[PDB]
């Protein structure tokens, strides 16, 4: 009766950051120990809570968010951060309590001539609210002339593709990111630790 953290971290394919996937983990026993034991982790940043004490806590719900971004952009997955990824693709609340877990995945998400399948939102007229998912592919209107669904002057495609190539530097290589958000409300707990 263990929680399916394997389906989130050992997933064969990851989502793009604009269409980041969320798994609702509830009514299970969360080991949390398969994490903080694997050495294939570039960053493991926990805010407000400690993963060591996670095995002794109960939560009503646990959220796991999966996507792929560049190494330069992993810095922006943190409370009070700004940038293209933080403002238009994935935003954490300034009082975020949880963990952001990222590791290099150049072996899996890089193709010989470039993967070009992982996308990110380049244009947006306002910043995303925390935990918001904008999967719109509508042509971005940068002027006053209607775009009518075509791309051209003052009408750009809102999404940009990553040039994930194995010969890229460490910054440009793809990093799979999992964000663990812990929820607690005035409801009975459903996700407890091993004890």
């Amino acid at each position, epitope marked *: 009766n263990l929680c399916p953290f394997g389906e989130v971290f050992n997933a064969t394919r990851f989502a793009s950051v604009y269409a980041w996937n969320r798994k609702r983990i509830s009514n299970c026993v969360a080991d949390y120990s398969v994490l903080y034991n694997s050495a294939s*982790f570039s960053t493991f940043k926990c*805010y407000g809570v400690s993963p060591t*004490k996670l095995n002794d806590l109960c939560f009503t719900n646990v959220y796991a968010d999966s996507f792929v971004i560049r190494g330069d952009e992993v810095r922006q997955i943190a409370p009070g951060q700004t940038g293209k990824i933080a403002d238009y693709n994935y935003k954490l609340p300034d009082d975020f309590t949880g963990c952001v877990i990222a590791w290099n995945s150049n072996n899996l998400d890089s193709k010989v001539g470039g993967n070009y399948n992982y996308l990110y939102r380049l244009f947006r007229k306002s910043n995303l609210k925390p935990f918001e998912r904008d999967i719109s592919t509508e042509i971005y209107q940068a002027g006053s002339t209607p775009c009518n669904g075509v791309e051209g002057f003052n009408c750009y495609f809102p999404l940009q593709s990553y040039g994930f190539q194995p010969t890229n530097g460490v910054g440009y290589q793809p990093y799979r990111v999992v964000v663990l958000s812990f929820e607690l409300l005035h409801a009975p707990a459903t996700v407890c630790g091993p004890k």
Partner: antibody, heavy 119, light 114 residues
Framework: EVQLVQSGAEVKKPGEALKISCKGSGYRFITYWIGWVRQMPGKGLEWMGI????????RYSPSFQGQITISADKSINTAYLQWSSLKASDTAMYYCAGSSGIFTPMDVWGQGTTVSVSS | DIQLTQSPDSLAVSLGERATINCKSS????????????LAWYQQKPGQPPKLLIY???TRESGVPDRFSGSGSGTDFTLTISSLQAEDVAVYYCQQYYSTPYTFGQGTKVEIKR
């Protein structure tokens, strides 16, 4: 658990440069943040700053802002604390404290480094 | 910069009696969402590095004996030793990890009374 080991005692003249170290070992160290605490002779504990070795995100105290340079080396799991111009007032014991997260209690402490600055 | 003030500065307690240290804050340390106080208590024996005893103002770190107990909420917090022993003579600090910069208490020296 995690254990932190610091460098040896340093005796430097005023105006010299010094870089003390703090190397951490054990499992689940990827999640640990490293912070530096200064304890002047006979005084209490003063928090100087905190750094995360993974991305070197450094958060400095307003009191110690611009006076120190907290760095890290994620390849050898070592955090550093250095001064450009040591002062006689900087003589103290410098502890590095490890916390399994930011806004997490400091579980692991090093043995401390006695820095002595005097003419 | 949250300020933490302790009381008393010096505490004399007979061996086997109860010791109490008060810690006051200039701002509520309680994170209202998770309903926990981001405060900790540390024990530092002379010449030793500080040792963590109680975190979240109520939870006990592994290895700490039962005689140490944490209490308090909001801005007023207390650390209580039930049965003081010869090995408990040290200086105790209360530290907040709710807002950077982290600030420690002034410290309370606990000694055996004779």
């Amino acid at each position: 658990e995690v254990q932190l080991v610091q460098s040896g005692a340093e005796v430097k003249k005023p105006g010299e440069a010094l870089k003390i170290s703090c190397k951490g070992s054990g499992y689940r160290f990827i999640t640990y943040w490293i912070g530096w605490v200064r304890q002047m002779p006979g005084k209490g504990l003063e928090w100087m700053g905190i750094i995360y070795p993974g991305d070197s995100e450094t958060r400095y105290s307003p009191s110690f802002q611009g006076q120190i340079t907290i760095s890290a080396d994620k390849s050898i799991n070592t955090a550093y604390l250095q001064w450009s111009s040591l002062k006689a007032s900087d003589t103290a014991m410098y502890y590095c404290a490890g916390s399994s997260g930011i806004f997490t209690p400091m579980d692991v402490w090093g043995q401390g480094t006695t820095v002595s600055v005097s003419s | 910069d949250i300020q933490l003030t302790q009381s008393p500065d010096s505490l004399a307690v007979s061996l086997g009696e109860r010791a109490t240290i008060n810690c006051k804050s200039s701002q509520s340390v309680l994170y209202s969402s998770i309903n926990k106080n981001y405060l900790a208590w540390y024990q530092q024996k002379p010449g030793q590095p500080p040792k963590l005893l109680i975190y979240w103002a109520s939870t006990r770190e592994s290895g700490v004996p039962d005689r140490f107990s944490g209490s308090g909420s909001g801005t007023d917090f207390t650390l209580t030793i039930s049965s003081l022993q010869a090995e408990d003579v040290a200086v105790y600090y209360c530290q907040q990890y709710y807002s950077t910069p982290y600030t420690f208490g002034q410290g309370t020296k606990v000694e055996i009374k004779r």
